[PDB]
Amino acid sequence: TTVSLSAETLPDVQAGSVVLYRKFEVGEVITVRPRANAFDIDLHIKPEYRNLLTSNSVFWAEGGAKVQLNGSGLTVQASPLSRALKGAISFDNLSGASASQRKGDKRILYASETAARAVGGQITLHAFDAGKLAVGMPIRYLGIDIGQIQTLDLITARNEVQAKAVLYPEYVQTFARGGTRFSVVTPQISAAGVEHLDTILQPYINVEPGRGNPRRDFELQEATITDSRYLDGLSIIVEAPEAGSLGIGTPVLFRGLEVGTVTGMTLGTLSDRVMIAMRISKRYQHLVRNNSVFWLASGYSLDFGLTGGVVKTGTFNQFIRGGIAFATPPGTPLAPKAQEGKHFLLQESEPKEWREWGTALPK
Amino acid sequence: TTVSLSAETLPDVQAGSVVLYRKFEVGEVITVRPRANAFDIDLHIKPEYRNLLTSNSVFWAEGGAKVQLNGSGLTVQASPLSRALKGAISFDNLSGASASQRKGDKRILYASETAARAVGGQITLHAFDAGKLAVGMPIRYLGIDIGQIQTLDLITARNEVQAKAVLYPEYVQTFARGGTRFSVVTPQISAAGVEHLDTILQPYINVEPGRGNPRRDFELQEATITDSRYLDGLSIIVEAPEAGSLGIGTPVLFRGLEVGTVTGMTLGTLSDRVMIAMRISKRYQHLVRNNSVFWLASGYSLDFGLTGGVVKTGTFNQFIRGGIAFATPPGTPLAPKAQEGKHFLLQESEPKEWREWGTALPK
Numbered sequence: 001t002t003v004s005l006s007a008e009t010l011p012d013v014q015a016g017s018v019v020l021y022r023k024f025e026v027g028e029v030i031t032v033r034p035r036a037n038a039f040d041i042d043l044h045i046k047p048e049y050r051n052l053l054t055s056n057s058v059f060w061a062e063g064g065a066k067v068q069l070n071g072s073g074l075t076v077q078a079s080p081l082s083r084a085l086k087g088a089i090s091f092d093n094l095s096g097a098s099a100s101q102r103k104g105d106k107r108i109l110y111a112s113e114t115a116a117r118a119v120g121g122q123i124t125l126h127a128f129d130a131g132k133l134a135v136g137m138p139i140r141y142l143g144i145d146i147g148q149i150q151t152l153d154l155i156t157a158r159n160e161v162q163a164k165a166v167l168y169p170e171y172v173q174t175f176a177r178g179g180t181r182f183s184v185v186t187p188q189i190s191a192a193g194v195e196h197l198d199t200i201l202q203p204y205i206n207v208e209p210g211r212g213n214p215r216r217d218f219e220l221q222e223a224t225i226t227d228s229r230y231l232d233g234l235s236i237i238v239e240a241p242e243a244g245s246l247g248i249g250t251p252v253l254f255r256g257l258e259v260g261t262v263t264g265m266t267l268g269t270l271s272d273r274v275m276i277a278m279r280i281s282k283r284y285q286h287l288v289r290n291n292s293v294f295w296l297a298s299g300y301s302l303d304f305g306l307t308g309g310v311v312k313t314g315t316f317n318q319f320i321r322g323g324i325a326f327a328t329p330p331g332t333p334l335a336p337k338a339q340e341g342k343h344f345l346l347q348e349s350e351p352k353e354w355r356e357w358g359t360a361l362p363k
Numbered sequence: 364t365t366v367s368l369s370a371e372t373l374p375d376v377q378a379g380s381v382v383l384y385r386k387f388e389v390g391e392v393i394t395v396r397p398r399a400n401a402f403d404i405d406l407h408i409k410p411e412y413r414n415l416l417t418s419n420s421v422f423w424a425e426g427g428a429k430v431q432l433n434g435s436g437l438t439v440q441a442s443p444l445s446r447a448l449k450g451a452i453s454f455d456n457l458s459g460a461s462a463s464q465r466k467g468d469k470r471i472l473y474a475s476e477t478a479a480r481a482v483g484g485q486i487t488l489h490a491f492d493a494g495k496l497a498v499g500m501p502i503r504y505l506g507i508d509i510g511q512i513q514t515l516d517l518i519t520a521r522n523e524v525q526a527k528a529v530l531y532p533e534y535v536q537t538f539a540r541g542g543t544r545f546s547v548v549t550p551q552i553s554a555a556g557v558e559h560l561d562t563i564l565q566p567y568i569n570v571e572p573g574r575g576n577p578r579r580d581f582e583l584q585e586a587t588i589t590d591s592r593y594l595d596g597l598s599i600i601v602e603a604p605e606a607g608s609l610g611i612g613t614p615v616l617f618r619g620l621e622v623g624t625v626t627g628m629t630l631g632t633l634s635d636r637v638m639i640a641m642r643i644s645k646r647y648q649h650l651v652r653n654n655s656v657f658w659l660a661s662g663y664s665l666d667f668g669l670t671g672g673v674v675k676t677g678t679f680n681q682f683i684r685g686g687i688a689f690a691t692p693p694g695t696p697l698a699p700k701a702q703e704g705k706h707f708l709l710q711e712s713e714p715k716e717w718r719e720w721g722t723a724l725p726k
Binding site: 006009010011014032034036038039057063064065066067068069070074083084085086087128129130131132133152154156159160161186187189190191196200201202241242243244246265268269270271272273274295298300302303305306309319320321336338 | 384385386387388389412415434435437438440442443444456468469503504505506507509518533534537552554555557558590591592594595617618619620621629635667668669670671672673674675676677679718720721722723724725
């Protein structure tokens with residue numbers, strides 16, 4: 001006996017399966033004993049390989065011929081036949097597994113490979129619904145996996161589901177700083193188009209980072225800005241009497257080209273107006289001046305007359321998410337650039353002569 | 364022989380398969396005898412393991428190489444070959460299995476793992492249709508599984524299907540209190556969007572809790588408020604001459620932002636008006652005053668003139684579910700906040716100057 005484990009319900013072995021290391025057959029399980037809560041598993045490894053496991057080592061289990069589904073092949077496990085008859089145990093060293101040994105009396109045999117990889121800083125999410133969540137669901141920043149949900153707990157006192165998740169130790173300092181948005185992504189299949197389709201089989205959580213004090217207590221949003229191409233530029237606040245078709249992700253347009261998005265929407269400190277937070281790119285940051293009229297270009301507008309009318313349809317994406325356009329009035333000196341937090345207000349209608357302005361905005 | 368069972372139709376074993384405990388091979392089946400109603404099964408367990416089963420112990424059966432469908436793998440049962448040739452029997456201790464031994468002469472071998480887990484308080488549902496129901500169908504609160512349907516019975520006297528279900532013993536006091544809404548969830552695939560897609564393969568029952576006396580006799584609704592984010596705030600009643608596009612789940616809007624939903628719709632005590640129950644959040648509870656005009660903002664409204672008309676489209680979700688908006692008229696003292704049950708009435712049209720009001724509503 002070299003290392004002893006604990007495991008709740010694993011179909012791995014009574015005795016005699018092989019220990020895997022980097023998917024390679026080194027070692028053997030010599031004794032399990034069942035218990036009403038959790039097993040106690042004794043492993044043998046060879047003495048030249050006793051250096052190959054250290055304190056930073058997590059063990060995980062798999063059982064049966066695991067026929068992968070992916071793409072080309074239904075790849076059968078060319079395995080030790082011990083895996084076919086009983087099922088094997090694998091392990092690997094990693095970076096931050098020292099904290100997993102500080103907890104518990106000894107190591108724990110995880111039921112899956114990803115459940116062993118769930119190391120790092122441990123945050124808590126507060127969702128109103130766990131219908132979109134799952135254990136082992138990845139948390140992805142820019143499509144790259146940075147975290148993982150490890151449990152889901154229902155609370156009946158506070159009507160909410162607390163999901164505890166981990167962030168991998170490279171990302172626990174960068175994220176978990178407050179102002180960090182978490183959101184599940186769902187497949188969007190409409191008449192307008194299909195947006196996400198991998199999330200049929202494998203949903204995940206998108207994350208947008210924030211700046212502030214290390215909170216490590218978050219709640220799960222409804223929508224989150226997906227691309228971080230607008231994360232660097234200025235974040236002006238735009239005031240409106242009503243929300244309308246505005247939502248998170250609604251584009252901001254300069255002459256029909258998308259220069260920013262709507263970050264979030266909230267009411268005022270005294271509830272008389274809806275103030276809309278939006279970020280502009282670094283490239284198009286110089287377009288926003290101290291005099292820049294903003295207006296709601298949302299949906300379709302068509303005209304009519306007494307002697308005759310002529311209408312326009314322009315296949316707008318503002319019929320999908322009604323975008324805010326802007327322009328700068330002409331002035332022979334230019335007004336200064338907008339600061340980081342600058343409060344504009346919407347024009348109730350489109351200005352008449354903005355197509356005729358042609359304000360020279362350099363650089 | 365240690366423990367004797369009864370089982371209706373199970374392909375487990377004639378003699379010699381293994382007894383599983385926490386998915387581990389401990390024990391053996393020594394004698395079955397078939398009978399016209401139900402088997403009688405004799406089990407042997409080792410004496411050091413005779414402490415590992417108690418009165419709170421349920422037994423269940425499975426037969427064959429059960430190739431799971433889920434995600435990554437078609438995982439084959441790395442099993443005792445006794446399971447491959449015949450099929451095995453598993454068991455586990457749990458909390459509330461003492462009542463299952465008080466019923467019947469002895470224990471019963473369930474045909475599945477979930478059918479053994481169906482312990483707790485036993486409620487009864489009255490559905491008009493069992494086309495959406497099934498035995499073993501989960502009952503979920505906030506996406507977390509709290510119960511299970513265990514039978515479906517058709518009654519020809521009262522034209523209804525009585526489904527008897529169980530609630531797990533943590534939740535039988537919290538739920539089953541009257542004013543509790545049960546509803547099946549169906550996949551909604553439209554031109555407007557796809558709403559539920561996991562319910563293609565695995566439908567469930569959503570539940571909204573209530574407050575009152577412990578009824579334990581319920582009926583299955585058509586729609587139920589999914590998220591409990593509006594469960595805490597005040598529940599005002601709003602009176603209308605007609606229903607219209609209003610339904611359960613229809614949003615309540617303040618300046619275009621969603622502050623509540625419509626809970627339920629019913630007629631008056633004398634049938635001259637439709638009164639609409641709606642709940643507002645705790646955050647936006649201070650927005651509702653004793654003078655707050657409500658109006659139906661449902662569908663699309665566009666204008667026209669003699670000399671010319673100009674129209675508006677705003678990609679409303681009120682074309683999906685026509686939402687009720689509100690606003691507070693300006694007054695230099697504020698009116699008091701609305702109580703828990705406060706009866707308003709709809710304005711037949713939108714007020715003219717509500718965009719120009721700008722009533723200062725603090726906190």
